[PDB]
Amino acid sequence: PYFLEAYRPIRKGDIFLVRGGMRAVEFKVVETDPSPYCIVAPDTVIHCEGEPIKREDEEESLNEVGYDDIGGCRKQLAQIKEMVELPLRHPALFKAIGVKPPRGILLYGPPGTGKTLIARAVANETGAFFFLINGPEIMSKLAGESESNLRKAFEEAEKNAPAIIFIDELDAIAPKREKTHGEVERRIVSQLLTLMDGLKQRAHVIVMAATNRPNSIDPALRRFGRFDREVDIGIPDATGRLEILQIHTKNMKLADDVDLEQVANETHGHVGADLAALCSEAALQAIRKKMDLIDLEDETIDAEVMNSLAVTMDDFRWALSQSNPSALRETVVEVPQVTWEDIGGLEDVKRELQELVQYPVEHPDKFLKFGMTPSKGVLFYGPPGCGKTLLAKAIANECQANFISIKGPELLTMWFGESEANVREIFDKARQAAPCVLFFDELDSIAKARGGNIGDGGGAADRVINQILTEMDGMSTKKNVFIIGATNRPDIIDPAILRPGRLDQLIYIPLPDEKSRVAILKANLRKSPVAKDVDLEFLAKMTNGFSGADLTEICQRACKLAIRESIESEIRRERERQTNPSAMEVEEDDPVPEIRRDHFEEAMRFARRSVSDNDIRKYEMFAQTLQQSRGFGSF
Amino acid sequence: NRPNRLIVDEAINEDNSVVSLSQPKMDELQLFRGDTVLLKGKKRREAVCIVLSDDTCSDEKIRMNRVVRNNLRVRLGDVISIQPCPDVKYGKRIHVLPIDDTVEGITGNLFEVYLKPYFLEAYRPIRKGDIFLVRGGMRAVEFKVVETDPSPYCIVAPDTVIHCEGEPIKREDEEESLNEVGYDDIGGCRKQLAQIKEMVELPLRHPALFKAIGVKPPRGILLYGPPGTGKTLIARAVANETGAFFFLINGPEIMSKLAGESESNLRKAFEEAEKNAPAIIFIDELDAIAPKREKTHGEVERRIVSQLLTLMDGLKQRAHVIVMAATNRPNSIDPALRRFGRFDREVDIGIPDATGRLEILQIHTKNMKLADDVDLEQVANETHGHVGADLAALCSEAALQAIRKKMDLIDLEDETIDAEVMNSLAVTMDDFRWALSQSNPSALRETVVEVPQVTWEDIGGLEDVKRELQELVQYPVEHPDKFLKFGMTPSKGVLFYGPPGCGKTLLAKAIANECQANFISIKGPELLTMWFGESEANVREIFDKARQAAPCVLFFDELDSIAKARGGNIGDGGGAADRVINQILTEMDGMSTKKNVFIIGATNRPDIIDPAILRPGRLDQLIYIPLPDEKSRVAILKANLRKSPVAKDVDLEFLAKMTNGFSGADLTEICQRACKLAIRESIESEIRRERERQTNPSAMEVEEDDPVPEIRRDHFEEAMRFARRSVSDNDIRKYEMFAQTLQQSRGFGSF
Ligand SMILES: Nc1ncnc2c1ncn2[C@@H]1O[C@H](COP(=O)(O)OP(=O)(O)OP(O)(O)=S)[C@@H](O)[C@H]1O
Ligand SMILES: Nc1ncnc2c1ncn2[C@@H]1O[C@H](COP(=O)(O)OP(=O)(O)OP(O)(O)=S)[C@@H](O)[C@H]1O
Ligand SMILES: Nc1ncnc2c1ncn2[C@@H]1O[C@H](COP(=O)(O)OP(=O)(O)O)[C@@H](O)[C@H]1O
Ligand SMILES: Nc1ncnc2c1ncn2[C@@H]1O[C@H](COP(=O)(O)OP(=O)(O)O)[C@@H](O)[C@H]1O
Ligand SMILES: [Mg+2]
Ligand SMILES: [Mg+2]
């Protein structure tokens, strides 16, 4: 199947790569009659006899790692190429400039995200001499044999300039100073510091290192001249996970029903090593389904027997059901997928959010010329279930920015177990991934947990909103990090937040009106196969005083009734079929393929209003007494 | 090619000379349940057996004992050709010899004890070249058929004579011993043993065939569990039953050496297991070698940990080496030993259940000779909290009591021991009773993860509740495709509420039994212990136990306990979220949808609960369980009284009819008080009859009879006088008002 419907122009002196049969194989065009090059025709004959030969001493292998084996981290790989490719490809041309290069790069991320892979791929695809230092290999030696190996490493990478030194697991060699007990460990740390200072007198040596988090490193290794540049390699997103699954299934031969996009959409919390383990485990189940024709050919393996091996979707289903990911506890920094069309109405709110978020990014020159400091925060308020998280995700999607979400229990965990460095780590994550929208859901949670209208005593500032205020005041204006908070109880919030410079804009989001609920129901029902409705506009018209969560509840109850009836029909037909064996008319049909009006007409009987009229009266009174106006024309 | 080619499966029928086949294979070969077939194996050796039938057998496999399996030079997963042999020849002379390492305590006669009930009513087809195993007399012994006159094979007849004279000989250099451990010695952990076989058997039995695939194997497995659950046993059994070279590393043996002699022994271990690929390295007690980094003080311990890390990374350049390790809990290991490429797979070997404990007691009592009244099922039902080593100690301790009851005929035969004297030794049920009364188990503090035994018939009525729980729990497991097609996210939690004693724990156990899922129960004091002694990692460890044993039902009894302990309607201040329900909320939000872990809570005070739990996505379904009605109480009383021998009732329906406003606990109280009155009267009658009997000695009419064998209506008519209502009408009024104001309806037909 390689030359068929291909017409490949080959030439004597070419090596090509054929994948398939869970194996990649390299062939070399040894002899052709139309020398040097020819297009392969059906007239051709291919004499594939002969003995396999070895490799030429200069021909590099396609088994080793290039940029193709890396998926899901295109931006960080581009950033590392921009840092490193110019002092390696042009050493002497950069020597005559007068610009200092970087001399230490610190990769960090969770375990399994492929940092050794990125280091080796940037090594091999530039021709630089790559030396590897492994942490436990040095720390497993004797007292005086560790420093000699470090000195041999740096002195050997001197002579092959340009070179790359990759120190793997820097947490093992040089941890925090309080975690070092002894004198040998401190001599190793001081030896590494001395060599990293000695790089400045050297020429064309780049030192890379890889950790698991920044805060486990001796902070003397982070100053200027020693690992000043830091790269963050986070967990992948859905496009990234699809790219990982496409990389690891190159050689394997999938069946026809296998759709990798649904598998990539299902895996949440999986780093790349988990996806490699998932692919290998599903392939082992596909082998262990048939150990009948495999075992009888024991001595040799033919490729057609493994061509009979094809992995199905049930293999990936079982591999999803068995595997447990490792990055569930980590925070998710990614672009949302909610667009404006999932939200019904609220048009002036969309206009105001586009004025606040998007105009300082697209047109900075107008704010420079007119001389205005841009605002930095927004507080939404309103009844529960009225779509505040959806507006935050939608405005993070319109500007193509990242999105970090912080719930109420993550604030109450900081409240009960008294810990406040985590608030600083949050704003660090928000600054390393700028531009982003940082969303604080339920700011009133601590002020509600401490008391009602009357707390323990004096319901002013608490411990955690205090650190939020200090970090907002310490915020740089150039980074474009935009902070949104959300409440349901606007009257018990700390008034020091609403002072100009912290969160000055207030937006009230009301219950959705008669036109919005149609766009709510169409957005909720877009996956369930509904059919043959008479008047969905009447369904939105009869419901008055209903938030979005209530309409979602109605749709979920209708789906419940549909699934129950479609299981009862299958049970009854199977019972009546098996009661009279050898059923003469086997004519298969789906009894309930779509959801009809009977299900909605039954499920509307269980509908309820979540918000009373006293609460609506309170939000209307806060909105009235918030607004004061002069209304007088000065001219 | 040929339909007689078969692969070896495990043994179920515990007879030695019995193989098994499936029904369509025997109908394809046209056999019978009394035939005699022949099996060809490796090294040009065969074995004759008796074929029977089995319905649990697979398609192209055969089930046989370890004796027949070792007599063919065959391991698990090999190939065997079967052929019929109608050559039914009766034997004439059978010359057998014992083996010296299994007779080194017994002497004198062996024909009457071991062999005389062995061939009687057996008709065993034997052959020259067979070794068979006889158990009995607290000893297992191996005999070898040395000479027969109908060569090669013959069926043993009563016409035969057996010349059991001669000297015991040694073992052939290649004949493996039946003293060593196989899969038969392991009981109670069938699922974990099957999982380890699925992980390990394919990279060992087919090394080069797996080498040419392109799939990486596992390269480190971490067994963990409480002490005494048999982890070294499982490692050694998976070692010996695959033919892999097994090297043992013991933790204190390395940590007891000098400063520079430990790393050399580790290097010798890994380098020696290189040369014998495929090999298995078992590192026992990994807590001793590589503990947590804060618990290592010194430099030698950290050099040993870094040496182990370097070798485990060096396995990736090696070929066909599997490293197993065994701990007591995961959280005592340096977390660098758990990343990818170093012990990525973890197996949990928990404490056994009742079927498991029965299987342990059947394994350890193979050689011992029990009496007639000994029922191992009641002993297995009684032992709770016992790991397998406790059960082995229980069996040995009861056998020592049975020996120390009679030290009269034992002691006088001091020089030699005859087997008939130990055949007089028989263990009774009183021995196991005393051994139960003396022993103290070690796993009482551990949590119990097991399938419940309560069915739907222990619960009276509540039919729509049963229907709703089957809709919520069971339909996303049996029919995932309907939820995929209609596009619905399944719900995840349920909150029961109602009066106390109305059967919420029974419904939770019953729905865990209907779906055949595990069940983890968490009481109110286990939440208040986390409240007073401020500790919140235990909530994360609970959900870890719930995810490692999926599918399961996780039951939080008394969610209102902390909100009741902190205050009434008015707490200390602002009765919102507390510390522990907060961690429950974060762990519920961090829950994967594919695992099918189903969470149930239960309260009695629905109005003081945290309202952040009832938000969609955490616990959205609410179910009210009322006081049982007039029809339910009959099924309550029949379920309670099913063990007590009641008799001759007139109207049990009247007994359920007169009691109005009574929960299930009150009816259970009535039944227990009736049993109290019955036991008191049946002891008073025995005391009075013994006193009147002894007052007039030499009683002429000794005619034994039970005065009160059954419970009569007088006991119930007396015990009903002490009955009381536990729930007042104000509480019922409050639950009815919460149920009314919870429900709102439109009731309008849209069409
Ligand atoms: N982004 C990725 N693209 C492709 N394969 C990946 C990726 N990330 C991980 N893998 C696979 O998973 C393996 C593990 O990668 P590693 O380099 O070991 O990750 P790691 O960061 O080194 O983990 P630690 O902390 O060193 S144990 C790689 O060898 C690949 O086979
Ligand atoms: N599941 C079991 N089946 C049969 N016998 C068992 C079982 N578990 C334990 N035993 C018996 O109890 C003994 C103790 O087993 P061990 O392998 O020592 O358990 P363990 O896990 O090694 O305990 P530690 O932590 O190493 S002290 C075994 O040698 C058996 O005699
Ligand atoms: N305006 C809206 N239009 C459509 N669906 C909505 C709207 N508001 C809420 N929803 C629905 O309710 C849920 C989102 O609620 P959300 O806005 O996050 O609530 P809250 O403001 O209380 O945090 C989703 O099921 C979403 O589809
Ligand atoms: N509906 C019932 N049917 C049968 N027995 C019941 C019923 N309700 C309670 N019981 C019995 O009374 C007790 C109820 O315990 P449990 O269900 O845990 O009570 P609660 O729900 O009040 O916590 C048990 O002894 C149980 O067997
Ligand atoms: Mg690495
Ligand atoms: Mg052990």
Numbering used by the authors:
A (entry chain B): 137 to 771
B (entry chain A): 21 to 771
Reproduce text from the manuscript describing this model.
The conserved ATPase p97 (Cdc48 in yeast) and adaptors mediate diverse cellular processes through unfolding polyubiquitinated proteins and extracting them from macromolecular assemblies and membranes for disaggregation and degradation. p97/Cdc48 forms a ring-shaped homo-hexamer, with each protomer containing an N-terminal (N) domain, two tandem ATPase (D1 and D2) domains, and a C-terminal extension (CTE).
Using the same dataset, we determined five structures of p97 in total: three SH conformations (I, II, and III), and two DH conformations (I and II).
